[PDB]
Amino acid sequence: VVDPDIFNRDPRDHYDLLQRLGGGTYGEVFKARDKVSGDLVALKMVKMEPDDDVSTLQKEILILKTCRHANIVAYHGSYLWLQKLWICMEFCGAGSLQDIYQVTGSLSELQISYVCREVLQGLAYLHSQKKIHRDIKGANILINDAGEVRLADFGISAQIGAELARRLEFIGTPYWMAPEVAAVALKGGYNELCDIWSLGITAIELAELQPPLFDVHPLRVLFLMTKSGYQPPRLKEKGKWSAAFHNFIKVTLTKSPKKRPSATKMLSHQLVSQPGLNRGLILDLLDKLKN
Amino acid sequence: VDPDIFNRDPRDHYDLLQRLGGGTYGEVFKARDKVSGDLVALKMVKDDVSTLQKEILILKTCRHANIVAYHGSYLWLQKLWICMEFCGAGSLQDIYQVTGSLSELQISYVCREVLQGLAYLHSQKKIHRDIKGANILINDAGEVRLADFGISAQIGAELARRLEFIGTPYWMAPEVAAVALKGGYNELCDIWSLGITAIELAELQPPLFDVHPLRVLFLMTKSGYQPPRLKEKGKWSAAFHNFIKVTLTKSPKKRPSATKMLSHQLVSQPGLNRGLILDLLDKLKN
């Protein structure tokens, strides 16, 4: 069973499908309207046929259903009907920051600062629940028509969670196992501070339209990160960005997780504490997107 | 694809003498080579055979006296027969379940021989990951052979599979990339397992054997976990207690390598030889 609170009914009983927004490996996403309230929702539809593995989708729903924070996409339930699973969420009309910057070009420093503050608020909430997003990037940060910021796409977090559960199920007898082996099997070998690093990379992505080393073979990038002299990336254009932005990048991209600041600590950084960070900055961006 | 597979009937080459066990992976036989008379172990198998493929490749690429020797594989009638050196006494667990606890000198010899095998494996960039009495075999001359690389193969396969579906890495933190490529721990896990095995041979159970395994996993993953110890202090020399202390070093950054452990007083002392285990096998028989 995918989730103990699934609605075993046709989602079309409750929603009018308005537009297919896209589709691929993850399934398809629809814009729909609540037939009673008139509110808009996103429906993510995935095939869910007998003997398919439900574990990843199960974990994704578990994450969404237990979050109640403005900066995490709101969850309105899931439907299982005729071997399709529909996950219903708050609609973000502008899509992701990647959808936006592919049209607008690079964001301003103030726009990036607001985005980073909103993402850090969502991360601090997730971390206080002992959750880890594990896939912070422009493609997974959604923007609504009011310029508000929502973390979404917990698929990677759910995949990791489901694999972690499978590791525990088949760990075998533990009595000869070294503690660090048990720790990797139970906890994964890293912690929530990985999300802070990913946010620093995301800030570079919003500034430059690509993450660092985007043109290097992925396996080479992984290898370089494991060398003892690996150097965190930096913003390319020194004079374009303030010292505060360069320092935000420096501290979020702290190599050692033992020394990397938490989401709550980062919320005190000058870049995201400064006045004038509000959704109007992103309304400006969305106007550019249409103008 | 193993390029050396013999595409012919193994029974045209070996006389099957005794089924030793198996299931549901397959069956294990004691067999005799038809031309030489040497005994061998034949493991018959058969799905996704890929992890078994990786397991055979481990055995095939190892060439060390303390690793059970590999002779070849026969493919016949959708059954793969893996031919290995025969160890007539079985595992140390098979033995101690009859004889009772080993002497300190017997344990010292076993530990030296396992450390030699581990030093070889680690230099080959392999991790055994399942060192325990059940996986250490004893031949009829009292010599020690590491065996059962099934866990090593399974963990390597699973590390490779995760790597294949890791997705794009450009937003990943370095510690996440390191877990993806290197698995989150290293070969020093085998040194810890050897320390537990030494307690097992001394006491007939690993520490915490009567604690629920999920509780053991809970305790071991907390920052305050204390490494176990031998329970009957006066029975064992200071050198044995110290060997346990250092092999069971909690921090993998401080735990000694197999080569370093081979210089420890317990395993470098004189009088450690296969005659000690021949005595054990005599006790097993008599």
Ligand SMILES: CC(C)n1ncc2cnc(Nc3cc([C@@H]4CCNC4)nc(N4CCC(F)(F)C4)n3)cc21
């Ligand atoms: C991650 C996804 C399952 N998800 N989760 C919650 C959520 C809330 N709102 C949206 N909103 C949007 C808006 C737009 C706008 C159309 C025109 N430009 C962007 N596109 C898209 N997607 C095009 C590619 C897709 F995967 F189909 C989605 N989603 C998507 C949402």
Ligand SMILES: CC(C)n1ncc2cnc(Nc3cc([C@@H]4CCNC4)nc(N4CCC(F)(F)C4)n3)cc21
């Ligand atoms: C790990 C195994 C596949 N393997 N690999 C190489 C190898 C070389 N020699 C043996 N020798 C023995 C001796 C004995 C002795 C019979 C009387 N007591 C132990 N039993 C067993 N088996 C009991 C349960 C099994 F898996 F079938 C094996 N194997 C086993 C070997």
